[PDB]
Design a protein around this ligand. Structure first.
Ligand SMILES: *[C@@H](C)[C@H]1/C(=C/c2[nH]c(/C=C3N=C(/C=C4\NC(=O)C(CC)=C4C)C(C)=C\3CCC(=O)O)c(CCC(=O)O)c2C)NC(=O)[C@@H]1C
Length: 172
């Protein structure tokens, strides 16, 4: 899979022409690693082989990817801020998403991206069945809204990729 996932990121970037796009594999201990990444004009350094700390994503946000499978970051210019709430109570996957066309990320995450030279990035999850295997994400150094039609291409492409993770898994 590590090999296939590598080629998958090469085709993805092409379709989305995104400067940088990487695949994120989720481990059972919460830790994840980068097994796929592509850079345009060496503009963005390589992070391949680097391990990211799960602490980067508590759990509430991670659930949304498995519950509603929908999350995107708007132009850091719009300064969108996110925060926790006492109401909590997450919504099941049985009921409709009922979420805004956009998702704000707390300031602590805003800078994290800014420090990465990212302004607007789309986060498409890679899952199979009821479990989550990994997470996909595209980085754009410029504002660019998404369309329902174009959204499917990528949103679907990811689903087609997540499916590869499942079928290929049987191999190993
Ligand atoms: C600050 C106090 C906390 C923190 C920030 C933080 N990050 C998220 C969520 C995400 N962060 C990323 C980052 C990445 N993009 C990549 O390309 C990669 C490697 C391939 C990473 C790791 C992503 C994709 C997410 C998920 C999207 C989302 O916004 O949920 C959060 C959660 C958001 C929230 O607060 O609701 C936070 C807080 N990092 C820390 O260590 C602190 C805990």
């Amino acid at each position: 899979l590590d090999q296939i996932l590598r080629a998958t990121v090469e085709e993805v970037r092409a379709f989305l022409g995104t400067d940088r796009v990487k695949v994120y594999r989720f481990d059972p201990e919460g830790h994840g690693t980068v097994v796929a990444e592509a850079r345009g004009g060496e503009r963005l350094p390589s992070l391949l082989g680097l391990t990211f700390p799960a602490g980067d994503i508590p759990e509430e946000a991670r659930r949304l990817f498995r519950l509603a499978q929908v999350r995107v970051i708007v132009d850091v210019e719009a300064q969108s801020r996110s925060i926790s709430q006492p109401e909590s109570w997450g919504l099941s996957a049985r009921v409709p998403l009922g979420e805004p066309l956009q998702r704000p990320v707390d300031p602590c995450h805003v800078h994290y991206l800014k420090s990465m030279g990212v302004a607007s990035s789309l986060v498409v999850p890679l899952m199979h069945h009821q479990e989550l295997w990994g997470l996909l994400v595209s980085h754009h150094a410029e504002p660019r809204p998404y369309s329902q039609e174009e959204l499917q291409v990528v949103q679907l492409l990811a689903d087609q990729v997540s499916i590869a993770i499942a079928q290929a898994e049987l191999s190993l």
